[PDB]
């Protein structure tokens, strides 16, 4: 948990993940040139800061289910155009991998997972949404509730997913379920999409 200087990958906007106060996160990808790590960032107004390619430094952040959370008290610091980092490309790809679904639905232990899934069915029931999603080794469900049933995610859509937790059922029956911090950003097919 010491001070790390790390190349900013991506970030997502800011977003309400608390609709009763209204708190706001951002999520962000960042990387050493050894490793990559998932960042939850509490303070909105370090947007700027997680611009991609900028190279920042962390420290007095908070480890917490395997992200580092960053709060007002968090130190986040330019770091000039000395450093020159490079980030191996194979790294940065790892960043993007989206886990294989029969690996994550026969999963014994929790976790929370990232990736992008493409829906084959959807299922509203009540106030929570189930969608089947599938890749070339298996389907499973993902488990919406709350701010996200409103999302717009048809068959053929794409869910890209961050911080959804993996709950382990036994028969490879484990299912992704959002959870506080979870985003969904839906990547829309050119034949469900708006047009003009």
Same mark, same amino acid.
């Given at each position: 948990s010491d001070l790390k200087e790390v190349m900013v990958l991506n970030a997502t906007e800011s977003f309400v993940y608390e609709p009763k106060e209204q708190k706001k996160m951002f999520h962000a990808t960042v990387a050493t040139e050894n490793e990559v790590f998932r960042v939850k960032v509490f303070n909105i107004d370090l947007k700027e800061k997680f611009t991609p390619k900028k190279i920042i430094a962390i420290a007095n952040y908070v480890c917490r289910n395997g992200f580092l959370e960053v709060y007002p008290f968090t130190l986040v610091a330019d770091v000039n155009a000395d450093r020159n980092m490079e980030i191996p490309k194979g790294l940065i790809r790892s960043a993007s991998v989206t886990p294989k679904i029969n690996q994550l639905c026969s999963q014994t232990k929790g976790s929370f997972v =990232? +990736?992008?899934?493409?829906? %084959? &069915? &959807? =299922?509203?029931? +009540?106030?929570?949404t189930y969608y089947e999603i599938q890749d070339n080794t298996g389907k499973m469900e993902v488990v919406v509730h709350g701010r996200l049933t409103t999302i717009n995610c048809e068959e053929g859509d794409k869910l890209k997913l961050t911080c959804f937790e993996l709950a382990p059922k036994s028969g =490879?029956? +484990?299912?992704?379920?959002?959870?506080? %911090?979870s985003h969904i950003k839906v990547i829309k097919t050119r034949k469900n999409a708006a047009a003009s």
């Open positions: =990232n +990736g992008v899934f493409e829906v %084959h &069915k &959807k =299922n509203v029931r +009540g106030e929570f =490879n029956t +484990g299912e992704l379920r959002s959870v506080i %911090h």
